Symmetry: C6
Subunit: 69 residues, 6 copies
């Protein structure tokens, strides 16, 4: 409801368990891989080659399998 | 008009009421489902497949039925 | 001027006076209605169906008739 | 180099002289008229019909005649 | 680095040496001229007609000839 | 916290890694990071350009990079 009390445990949960995710950007582009790390501004997506991904360019994050906290 | 004094009760009603909402993104992509939770930056949209949506990517939130503030 | 010291008087007038407005979004979509309420982050636009509109996705708010501020 | 130290005087001058301005939106649309007023977030652009333009939506402000 | 400890010196020097830069906006438009002045939020781009350019709508600023600091 | 973003960007800059830099509008840039601050990255090549971070979508390095 305020702060990152959902965004942060959601992303660490998806980090801690090596869940495959789809990352859609605002430009439409879809990324896939595993979330190595993240801070307030960026995410490290691990795949073939890996990518640091600015959260401001993120529309959605869709885990490959249902997750919880 | 101060702070999230509309955005927070509005969306909290939707989560509490579990109303179907359509979420329209700034890029012209349509999301549909129900709001499981929210914080200052994101909204968990629930559906057959479930997504996390960064607010900054959303243009309008459009419920399925009338909601009273 | 200073802060949002122009935005709210403009919006609160449009709300208190039930003025039909046209809200334009940065993606080039047009929305039409009357401003039910607002806060720092969103606007509640009513008409056919109601909807919450993120301000960061708006470019212009154009009244259907002139107003004094 | 900080604050709105160039924006404030540029905008406040433009209003005080009521120079016709063209405002170009990030989405490529062109709005036009006079700056009647402004704050940290928006610019009131009067014309046939007046409108509130969010600053974040603007790409460029391009006056008709030079300001000083 | 921290803060504006590269941006401010870079645009300042472009201002001083009066380098004709080319400013590409996120929307793909190239606005070519010289930097009279800037503050935290805008660049003023002198040319045949001068114009205020909101920095948040900037993608890149490319100098005509390489520069130092 | 930028306890990832800054070191990561330091490491491409320290070891001088060729990088691709995709812009939110879908253009790819490419070169090496000479320097950065909170707002910009200075991308080096035959064309030296300053890049605003708000414009960047993904930074993709050419080869594997680890962050001690
Ligand atoms: K944490
Ligand atoms: K779990
Ligand atoms: K209710
Ligand atoms: K009125
Ligand atoms: K003047
Ligand atoms: K290394
Ligand atoms: Zn966080
Ligand atoms: Zn960012
Ligand atoms: Zn909130
Ligand atoms: Zn955001
Ligand atoms: Zn306000
Ligand atoms: Zn917002
Ligand atoms: Zn100001
Ligand atoms: Zn804004
Ligand atoms: Zn600065
Ligand atoms: Zn701005
Ligand atoms: Zn940093
Ligand atoms: Zn920026």
């Amino acid at each position: 409801s305020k702060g990152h009390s959902l965004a942060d445990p959601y992303l660490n949960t998806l980090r801690k368990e090596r869940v495959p995710v789809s990352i859609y950007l605002v430009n439409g582009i879809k990324l896939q891989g595993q979330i190595e790390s993240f801070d307030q501004f960026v995410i490290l997506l691990k795949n073939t080659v890996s990518q640091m991904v600015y959260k401001h360019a993120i529309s959605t994050v869709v885990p490959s399998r249902p997750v919880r906290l």
